[PDB]
């Protein structure tokens, strides 16, 4: 720990002078203890002239005091002298012209000391940002120049500081205010301290530094004055560490290293810094409940253990019996609900020596003057008023329409909320008080609310302690309580019977308390005093063990985690946490204006989000971390009408009489009108096209119906209590929800009944954790939870457990899959993940930069490295090869909305353009294929009123129209202003029919559960001239809603089987009977071969059914050897296939930034690819003999293909040079290369093309795919016709004519083993098995390769 520590803050954030009071009191105590003289006695002979910097004056005086009394040596002496000099320099007057410069430099020195004195401390870039802000806020100079001139002028400052210190010490060695104005001078230095001490700060002023029970005194002052010259003259020695010269030198070095109208208004706001070495105890906790203001809950500001426990809920009125504990609530020691326990409506106003003490419902004291009974008053920083009445009843206006009346029953000593009111809702809670021995005891709560009426009768024992909370006339108590002989609430049984047990020591302090499941949360307090702070708390098993240590001098707490990793929080006098210094040194900050509203938040990683409010106290400028200014505007009624996002796109609004938004004119002008019911709820919303959606609510306010824009109403039903008992679909299908009435999970969702009669059953514990889920088929998925409550095991229907392990902080430590392969996670002493064993021994090491963002991922082969922007959006990635050294870099650019705007890599650059609303309107894709003249493919998007996509002009000028019906339902897909399919939809807006342009008529019929039940395709009109396509697929599902049979007309009956989890383990049919063997993790196994392992432990299969695989050190397949085939895959640093050598026929692949293959070169043949997002819209082929382009048209918002139209030429794309190129040539695309051949797809239930038909309706192409995508036989009428051939496969895939690998977007899917040839780019975010494709290909897709 540094010998001397400080609290650097802003002048605006502090209104009281409590810290100044503490410093003055400490000085007075030192004077009394040493010189035996009060400040008044020494005031006379204290005529010394100094600048009117009260902060610097107090700091210097306090500094001088410690130096004279408390002697220090070593580095501690150097630091103390440095801080004394820093406080002095901003204190002496002459020269007057430099007073502002010196008083600005003093907080600079304070900040550099606070940030450099720490062991392994440095000037982070945020430090330089803060220094620049503080400097510029006052003189508006340059940080480098100011620091340099200070360094050159340091000697004069130190000389004048020595003179000032000599003068100050020449006031005591010999035996006998509130304005920080540079131009004002203190005639006497003692006078401001005396004036401070007189101020009624209302903050405890007990000195926190004890003198040494010694003597010396004047001897001490003589020694101090003698050594002042020695300690200050040597301060300038930059060679000496931890000195003003060293601070300036280090700050300059950091600045040099890191260099490679409304602003002025906020400068007047007071972002100027200010630091003190002594601070007063926080008055109380802040209203904030964030992780920075209270632990997982000891509030840091006061160290009070408060636990808010809800006993029962009255759903029809929205009342939860929140019992609030506060180990510092000595006023509620005799509280009827339990000692130091607060129930709802127990807040009251007590009488003390100071005056009236109000204890809000949250448990936060608010001392009020004795004049509240005679006049109105308002507590600062909250915004609620107290007003009296002639009848002695005090009304609290907490903010809103609620007025709470308080009455006194004993000489105006205790004011108990007799009842409340609500001129608005016309409601009002009535509290009936039983009086005994002049002690008012709450007896009945009358909830005379229009929602419902209740009589919360209470029952007391001999001690007058609530033992049961009844309702109206119910025999069952909503809440039962038990108290030990000391009056402590040692057990609180809620309405469901789930007891909570509380353990107290002999002083009403809660040491341990168990949740409803029996899991304790132990606590220990520094002492048995009522106000003693909680200093330690750990779950019963030791997890989450946290040690709080409050700094003796400052308003700081060192919150040690389970591994003694401190996190030093600093809080204001009101408890607001204005700083958070992590163990690694990253400091988060929070500025606050006089009203304690945040105006600047420098996060740990440097992100800064400011909040400039208007004269009406409304945030009218939220500058983002990226520099985007969002200027809100408000109308005369104080309503947010006009919002202006960073790009200038203005969201207008208009409000009705009830301050509800009745209009919403987005930037493009698509007005969205709402309507509300008298209860201030959305009853009806009108879109921009006129579509009207009607919403209905019941007496409770729970939505009970939603009439879609097309007159389709789905009704939600609720019992009297308000628990959802059914939700009916637009076609009258009821999903009835059933809740438990007894057991551990009483009152929770016990089961769900589905429209086909199948019942899901659940099981929870008392705290809501799922313990056992039974699926519709009866398969049980038991979950096991460890002592701390975190999931520790999940036993699925096969009895295969994914055992998790968590370290003492609740972070995942080791994850064990079904194969007993351990996925070790490693965390550095600072608590960041810095390792990952990936089930295969592949250790990924994570590095972090000074901003704490991920900096490198050192995989065994590739060393990823990230470069970020000021906002933290990645600016580039650098995948260096640790062995070969080849480096691949991607570069990103973002607009002011934080949306990707230009992504580039070696072989592409994608420029994304967006309209005011933020939707993609243009997408220029600058291909950079090697050996090929660079060319640009230009996508366009035209949108309708409701933001749907209605027209996309593909690069070669071909336009795909989506003619939309209503609120986004497609009734036809055009193609060059020529229809290619027209849909017909049912009540639920499900497609029940589509008329293809080739005269075919595909009707889909869905069963009760909405699963596809049949699919017939046939011509609208039949002709004997030719054999038009005609086939059908009737799908039958088993109890688990897994496709268990298909009555296909072409393939016959396809019967499937599944294992309990849901993995497909067989698929029999006439064509081929198949069987699959998955290990517990999910890897296909070669069961037929005995020597093959029974489980692929590392998830990387080395052999499966005649294919032997060879993986590199990153888990990607680098070779696949079988009978007569030797495929070698070359993976780039992004783990992407950039070359394939199949029996010597080398291929070459290339990808844009997003992993979308842009080409595939095979000797002279080149297959360009084009994407409009995640979908391969077109592909173009270049070769000596065959040139063609295919345009794949997919169904709306899906990867299922619809038709492919092409022309016998290479695609016509915008040759790279911009604004002139696309628009002119895109109109040259309006001339267009006419699509020669159309061909329509016909997929199965999951979107896999099963056949194809030309424009005349005939079948032209059939594929018999194996279950896992492997092509078994293709029946094409014209093999050579490239437009009658299909390379599409499982939804989102593409067959490769050279490798037989299906190219998913991000990975290559190798159908033989039904697993990707490389590990998932997103690691475990995709699943436990990172190489497996899917469990069930009949209903799961994985279209993007993740």
Numbering used by the authors: 14 to 189, 204 to 287, 298 to 333, 335 to 1255, 1267 to 1395
Q: What text does the study give?
A:
Tse15 forms a triple layered β-cocoon Rhs domain with an N-terminal α-helical clade domain and an unfolded C-terminal toxin domain inside the Rhs cage.
Single particle cryo-electron microscopy (cryoEM) of the purified wildtype Tse15 revealed two major 3D particle classes; both monomeric in assembly but one that resembled the expected β-cocoon of the Rhs domain and a second that had the Rhs domain with a globular protrusion at one end (purple and yellow respectively). A map of Tse15 was produced with the clade domain present at a maximum resolution of 3.08 Å. We could resolve the cleavage point between the N-terminal clade and Rhs domains, with the sequence matching the previously identified cleavage site and a clear break in the connective density of the polypeptide chain. The toxin density could be observed lining the interior wall of the β−stranded cage and appeared to have elements of secondary structure but not an overall globular fold. These chains were modelled as poly-alanine with some glycine residues placed to allow an improved fit to the density.
